[PDB]
Design a protein around this ligand. Structure first.
Ligand code: ZN
Lengths: 261, 169, 92, 50, 665
DNA sequence: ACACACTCTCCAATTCTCTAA
């Protein structure tokens, strides 16, 4: 048979991502703020990791002011202006530290799947209105405020998929989805060519919690002779059902662009 | 094939997941034997085997559903209760195929009355409203309460894909 | 049959439309100056050859024109006869 | 220049110096846990007797 | 049949439970494992299932069965670790033979399962079917072995070695020596397992880490940490250094070569010497990113994509073309480039190495592997002590082996030898370049005559049979020998060695080499260039020279040099300096100007010198512009003296006797 | 029946190899 290896497979690599990864690593290691009461180094974020280990949490909170003063602010600029590019590298950076100091947190008896950590930020410099969202800011890190008007029920979102062939006993794993439901391109076993009749293995695949909420501008802020605009916001993970209709809330994240699926 | 496991041998899940461990032949045969041994043997404090009495009344009413209390199944052979909580869709298949043997021990040729029996679980010891359900609950057994808002009419549905049907609503 | 393919060939080069045009005009076309940069003058040399290459045979990219010309230039004897004729004219 | 001899290494090798509730409940119970079936057949036979 | 297959699998499972099990009386939650009986027969029969059945049928099915029932992770490691910890405590205090027997027979299975995988056109269809999946399972093996109690099973293996270090060589039976070979054969496999290579059948033109495995589990960095904590580096260092004194050299030294190859492979030496720092260089890199962003902006229109008008460009002879877009209105260079870019065709293209895991030979090595601070210093300490202690004695033994065994060689051992030589010689040269505490005498065994003959012979035989991978590796090694010679002459027998290194036969070979490089991958041509630079420089400092240099200068070498140079976007700053050194040599010194008057060079200088390519402030632009000025000056002179060269510039030079001499000059 | 998406097939364009002047 005409077996052949992918000799040419060696990939292109982004140097900025790795340097950001292993600088954020150092920030997590040794931010080294002194105690609230004394001149003694406390290392608050390692303590927060220990806290998460104690209570089996899955999210970590970071102060933007702490990141601003680190290493002349270049890292904070890179995270702020290109969040969408650098978010995977930050995850890779945090995984190594949690492995180093609290390997019990890496897993969620049979084998246990990995924990999907979440990084969170707060205390950003300024808050924008819904009226200030503009396409030049796509992919950046922002904060927004408004009044909630609707909320959706919690739904499961497919995060990573795994499929098995009908015509032969073969399995495909770790397929990536993005915005539309996506399926493999070939049968991996070369003894079979069937592309049809895949089935999604619900056990092996992994899901996420997902909620839609809708907001409108604060009444006291509306300009002269105008009427309030609205926006749709996505909530995921441990923050679903936190919002309530009729309440006033403040959000933070990144604005994105959604296709016509 | 021939050899069987002990109940202590099932304490260690040896495959990568529960469902891939229940579905193996020797493990499945061991579970079937243990469930049959539980159903024929459980007692009140007064003796007075409850499930022998319930199988007796199953035929008296020409019925189709046997009812099993979860607390009884948890009081002895606890690992089976754990597996039932984790993988109901497999465990109930095995349990139904055991229940038919138990009923035919009382009433031979009950297959001519009904071809298949369903096990109903009762007193599951944890409860959710419709708020607390999350993606982690998928394929797990749950207990829920509420008000029934709307009801469709009854229809038949094709059972297998010679033909057989079942009711649906 | 399907339509046969069209190619660059030595007949096109030896045509009056072809290579003689360059030798008839190249002395007047290109002009170097010390008064402009190396990049400037280097960019100037390729203009005439690019436009001539397009006028001769619009099929393919410019690099492909050169690397196609290499093969027929090395192989064909009639083209080599024409080239030794040129350098004999200079030996005259 | 170093040498890293055998005898030093032999000497130095040795001398150097809520389902959360229910899961625990069921695991501990599992670790802790024909005449026996006679009650079943007695319930069967009582139909003959009564 | 399928039922026979599953019968054997069930037999393996029943053997995977007869082995024993932990104790349920213990009240210790959980205890360790506890031991069964018939276990000698169980381990022996499992060994027979591998050797007497699977090898004889060439299956890998048995390995699939043991992977299904997880024998390694579940039973073998706790058995060995319990033996190790029991004997360890007994040593702290300061039928037992049967315990030791079970230890030995568990380690042998550990070596067997993790044995690396080879696929050929003679492997069975069963093995070809099973290759991809057993790779996943062996990755799981590597992770698990390095993980348990922070890798404590590795201490058992060296204790088994210590039992055979114990008493005098004069007593040591062959079966005794097999243990000392086995313990190092283990470490070679643990280092060698790495992420898989994707392979498919070429029937139609159209990641493999399992869910439980990640990169940080599998990286070399993890292996350095795991080895240091579990006391391996001392064992290797003390074993290699005292190798000369009557450890029977035959059993140890080739596996001990394979280890040093198997974690030198993916390191650049500059990464081990430094030459807030991370954040500083990150900020500088962000400046570079801003420059690239600026480059994109300079080709970006102000007004939107549907605002655009239309442009018409008229040639001489009054013929007209059409192009769209707003920037085309103003920039004729962009219009000319955009006009040709629309055309569809590209000429399809021709393509050298297979059968060897990834290494310098077939990968772009401008991509480091990354270390903790402790790991960096520990690895530096290990190889520094290795060089100061073990390098000369190891190379003398292994080189005086291979001279007596060259005919019987296999490709692995050749490539291993040639890439062990090169790495350690180069590293010592750089370290002594940096600091005076180091010295060059530590690596001086490479120069003595036998090793020089052997490297020469490998390169010779590889070139003659057209085996190009060994030719590449021999090229790299011979480069480092010449560099080391140029070091020592800058300080008797070395000139004798030079004179024998540059007999006319070798000049014929070394002159032949760059010419064939035009066809091959990028790494081959780079090796040719660097070797050529060193070769010519050494013969420059010999004072013959005019004979040798004229041997090099001709068309096919220049073809290789231009073909290599046009991929400059992937290359280093240094290689372009080397190339333009050669072009200076050809053009100015030798005055063989006629070679470079060829059109595809004139395109390259436009591409490389434009605002497109080489940075405005990189050191390359100095060389490039200073070259191009003189080039166009001499070209102006030549073209006005003889107008025939306008047609000459397209084609190769003309080899006719009567006109060619005046053509070239 | 009228634009599309996808599959199948044959034929000649191209490069590689061997031989002799
Ligand atoms: Zn298939």
């Amino acid at each position: 048979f005409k077996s052949r290896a992918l000799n040419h497979v060696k990939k292109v690599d982004d140097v900025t991502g790795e340097k950001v990864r292993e600088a954020f690593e150092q920030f997590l290691e040794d931010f080294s703020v002194q105690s609230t009461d004394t001149g003694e180094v406390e290392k608050v974020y390692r303590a927060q990791i220990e806290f998460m280990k104690i209570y089996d949490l899955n999210t970590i909170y970071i102060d933007y002011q702490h990141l601003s003063m680190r290493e002349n602010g270049a890292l904070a600029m890179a995270i702020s202006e290109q969040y969408y590019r650098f978010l995977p590298f930050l995850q890779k950076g945090l995984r190594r530290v949690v492995r180093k100091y609290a390997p019990e947190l890496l897993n969620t008896s049979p084998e246990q799947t990995e924990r999907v950590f979440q990084i969170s930020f707060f205390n950003l410099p300024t808050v924008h209105r819904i009226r200030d969202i503009r396409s030049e800011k796509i992919g950046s890190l922002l904060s927004i405020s408004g009044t909630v008007t609707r909320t959706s029920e919690v739904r499961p979102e497919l995060y990573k998929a795994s499929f098995t062939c009908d015509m032969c006993r073969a399995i495909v794993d770790n397929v990536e989805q993005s915005f539309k439901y996506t399926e493999p391109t070939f049968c991996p076993n070369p003894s079979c060519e069937n592309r049809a009749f895949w089935t999604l293995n619900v056990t092996r695949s992994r899901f996420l919690d997902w909620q839609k909420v809708r907001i409108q501008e604060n009444a006291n802020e509306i300009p002269t002779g105008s009427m309030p605009r609205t926006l749709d916001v996505i909530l995921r993970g441990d923050s679903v059902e936190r919002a309530k209709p009729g309440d006033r809330c403040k959000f933070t994240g990144v604005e994105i662009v959604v296709p016509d699926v | 094939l021939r050899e069987e496991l002990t109940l202590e041998s099932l304490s260690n899940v040896k495959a990568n997941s529960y469902s891939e461990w229940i579905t193996q032949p020797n493990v499945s045969r061991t579970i079937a034997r243990e469930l049959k041994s539980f159903l024929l043997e459980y007692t009140d404090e007064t003796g007075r085997s409850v499930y022998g009495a319930r199988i007796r009344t199953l035929g008296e009413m020409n019925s189709e559903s046997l009812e099993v209390n979860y607390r009884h199944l948890a009081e002895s052979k606890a690992i089976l209760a754990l597996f039932l909580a984790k993988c109901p869709e497999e465990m109930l298949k095995i349990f139904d195929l055991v229940a038919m043997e138990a009923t035919e021990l009382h009433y031979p040729d009950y297959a001519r009355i009904h071809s298949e029996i369903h096990v109903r679980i009762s007193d599951f010891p944890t409860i959710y409203s419709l708020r607390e359900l999350r993606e982690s609950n998928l394929s797990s057994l749950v207990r829920v309460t509420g008000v029934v808002t709307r009801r469709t009419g009854v229809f038949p549905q094709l059972k297998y894909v010679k033909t057989v049907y079942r009711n649906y609503q | 049959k399907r339509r046969p393919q069209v190619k660059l060939t030595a007949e096109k080069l030896l045509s009056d439309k072809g290579l003689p045009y360059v030798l008839k005009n190249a002395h007047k076309r290109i002009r170097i100056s010390s008064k402009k940069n190396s990049y400037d003058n280097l960019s100037n040399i390729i203009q005439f050859y690019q436009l001539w290459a397009h006028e001769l045979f619009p099929k393919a990219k410019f690099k492909d024109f050169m690397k196609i010309c290499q093969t027929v230039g090395k192989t064909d004897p009639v083209l080599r006869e024409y080239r030794v004729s040129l350098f004999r004219d200079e030996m005259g | 220049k170093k040498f890293f001899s055998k005898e030093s290494f032999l000497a130095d090798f040795d001398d150097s110096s809520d389902h959360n509730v229910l899961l625990n409940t069921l695991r501990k119970a599992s670790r802790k846990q024909n005449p026996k079936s006679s009650a079943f057949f007695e319930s069967m036979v009582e139909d003959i007797i009564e | 049949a399928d039922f026979s297959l599953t019968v054997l699998r069930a037999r393996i499972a029943l053997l995977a439970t007869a082995i024993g099990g932990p104790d349920y009386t213990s009240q210790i939650d959980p205890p360790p494992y506890k031991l069964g009986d018939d276990c000698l027969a169980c381990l022996k029969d499992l060994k027979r299932w591998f050797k007497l059945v699977d090898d004889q049928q060439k299956r890998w099915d048995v390995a699939m069965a043991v992977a299904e029932y997880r024998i390694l992770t579940d039973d073998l490691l706790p058995i060995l670790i319990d033996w190790e910890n029991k004997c360890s405590l007994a040593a702290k205090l300061a039928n037992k033979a049967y315990y030791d027997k079970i230890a030995l027979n568990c380690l042998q299975l550990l070596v067997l399962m993790t044995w690396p995988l080879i696929v050929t056109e003679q492997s069975s269809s069963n093995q070809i079917t099973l290759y991809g999946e057993l790779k996943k399972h062996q990755l799981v093996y590597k992770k698990t072995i390095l993980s348990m109690e922070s890798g404590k099973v590795l201490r058992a293996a060296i204790r088994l070695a210590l039992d055979v270090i114990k008493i005098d060589r004069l007593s040591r039976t062959p079966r005794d020596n097999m243990v000392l070979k086995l313990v190092l054969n283990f470490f070679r496999n643990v280092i060698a397992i790495e992420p898989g290579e994707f392979t498919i059948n070429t029937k139609k033109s159209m990641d493999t880490l399992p869910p439980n495995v990640s990169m940080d589990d599998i990286s070399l960095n993890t292996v350095i940490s795991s080895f240091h904590k579990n006391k391996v580096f001392g064992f290797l260092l003390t074993l290699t250094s005292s190798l000369s004194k009557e450890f029977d050299q035959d059993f140890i030294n080739i596996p001990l070569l394979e280890i040093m190859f198997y974690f030198t492979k993916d390191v650049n030496q500059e990464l081990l010497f430094p030459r807030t720092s991370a954040g500083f260089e990150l900020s500088k890199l962000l400046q570079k990113e801003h420059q690239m962003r600026k480059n994109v902006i300079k080709h970006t229109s102000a007004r939107h994509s549907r605002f655009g008008g239309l442009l018409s460009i008229q040639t001489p002879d009054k013929t007209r073309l059409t192009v769209s877009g707003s920037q085309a209105l103003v920039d004729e260079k962009i219009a000319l480039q955009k006009l040709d870019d629309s055309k569809k065709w590209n000429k399809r293209i021709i393509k050298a190495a297979e059968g060897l895991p990834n290494s310098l030979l077939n990968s772009q090595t401008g991509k480091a592997i990354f270390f903790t601070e402790s790991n960096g210093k520990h690895f530096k300490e290990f190889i520094n002590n290795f060089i100061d202690s073990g390098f000369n004695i190891l190379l003398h033994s292994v080189t005086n082996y291979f001279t007596t065994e060259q005919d019987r060689m296999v490709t692995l051992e050749q490539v291993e030898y040639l890439l062990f030589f090169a790495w350690f010689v180069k590293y010592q040269l750089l370290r002594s370049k940096i600091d005076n505490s180091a010295d060059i005498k530590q690596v001086s065994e490479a120069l003595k005559e036998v090793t020089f003959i052997l490297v020469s012979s490998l390169l010779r035989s590889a070139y003659d049979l057209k085996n190009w991978t060994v030719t590449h590796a021999g090229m790299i090694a011979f480069n480092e020998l010449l560099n080391l010679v140029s070091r020592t002459k800058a300080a008797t027998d070395i000139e004798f060695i030079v004179s024998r290194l540059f007999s006319d036969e070798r000049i014929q070979l070394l002159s032949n080499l760059p010419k064939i490089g035009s066809k091959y991958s990028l790494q081959f041509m780079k090796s040719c260039i660097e070797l050529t630079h060193s070769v010519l420089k050494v013969l420059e400092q010999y004072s013959n020279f005019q004979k040798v240099q004229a041997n090099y200068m001709t068309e096919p070498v220049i073809e290789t040099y231009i073909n290599f140079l046009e991929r400059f976007r992937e290359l280093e700053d240094d290689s372009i300096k080397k190339v333009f050194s050669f072009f200076h040599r050809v053009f100015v010194q030798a005055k063989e100007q006629a070679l470079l008057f060829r059109f595809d060079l004139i395109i390259l200088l436009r591409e490389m010198l434009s605002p497109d390519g080489l940075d405005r402030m990189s050191r390359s632009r100095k060389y490039v512009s200073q070259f191009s000025d003189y080039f166009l000056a001499r070209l102006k002179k030549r073209l006005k003296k003889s107008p025939a060269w306008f047609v000459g510039l397209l084609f190769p030079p003309l080899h006719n006797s009567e006109v060619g001499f005046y053509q070239r000059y």
